[PDB]
């Protein structure tokens with residue numbers, strides 16, 4: 373037995389390999405010099421579309437998180453700039469993304485930073501939601517708490533987060549999944565940020581779909597995107613309804 377730190381995956385994250393079994397695991401080194409909540413949240417998780425948590429180890433000042441190694445890399449690296457990826461592949465990743473998000477929201481957890489860098493792939497190209505450093509509990513004892521903290525990455529963040537003092541957690545993760553779908557299908561992010569001062573975002577609200585990235589997207593998935601990227605979070609489509617959408621259920625090969 374004994375693990376070797378073979379290389380840098382991305383503190384930092386190193387790839388550890390068992391000297392006997394040759395089994396691998398990602399080790400996240402968190403120089404505490406987030407983390408507490410991240411370990412806590414990780415302990416509650418167990419789902420095939422969420423990066424597995426093996427355990428942790430303080431060992432002084434460097435906190436060590438032991439996480440599932442995803443040999444396929446980041447979804448981010450499967451997206452060709454300006455092109456996207458084949459629709460069938462994007463749909464399968466999107467189905468898997470919704471499976472992971474339904475699970476998280478089911479146990480009252482919001483990820484808050486969904487984007488392709490945080491969606492990793494295993495050996496069989498199964499999507500795994502990664503990094504719970506920004507995650508939080510939005511439901512406890514069956515009572516929902518509204519969020520107010522600015523968390524996320526601008527291009528993927530929901531507009532309410534920039535405009536409202538308080539907002540529901542779930543539609544924010546739905547929105548970020550819609551920007552991920554756009555990136556998969558167009559190899560392009562639609563706007564720097566979702567604010568009226570951003571020309572691209574204003575054009576979308578005025579339905580100028582003849583512009584990029586929308587023009588590269590087929591009408592069926594674009595119809596789903598019209599339901600997800602709705603400014604008013606109360607009017608935005610919910611996950612159960614996304615799962616009933618026409619494109620979501622279209623057979624593709």
Ligand SMILES: CCCC[C@H](Sc1nc2ccccc2c(=O)n1-c1cccc(Cl)c1)C(=O)N1CCC[C@]2(CCCNC2)C1
Nearest residue numbers: 448451453454488527555559560561562563564572584585
């Ligand atoms: C068409 C080729 C350009 C594609 C780039 S892709 C991109 N832009 C980013 C811009 C800001 C932050 C992160 C990214 C990023 O991760 N990607 C990125 C790169 C590769 C893969 C992935 Cl998933 C993301 C893009 O969408 N924009 C940069 C150029 C101008 C924008 C303005 C908004 C309207 N679309 C074009 C945004």
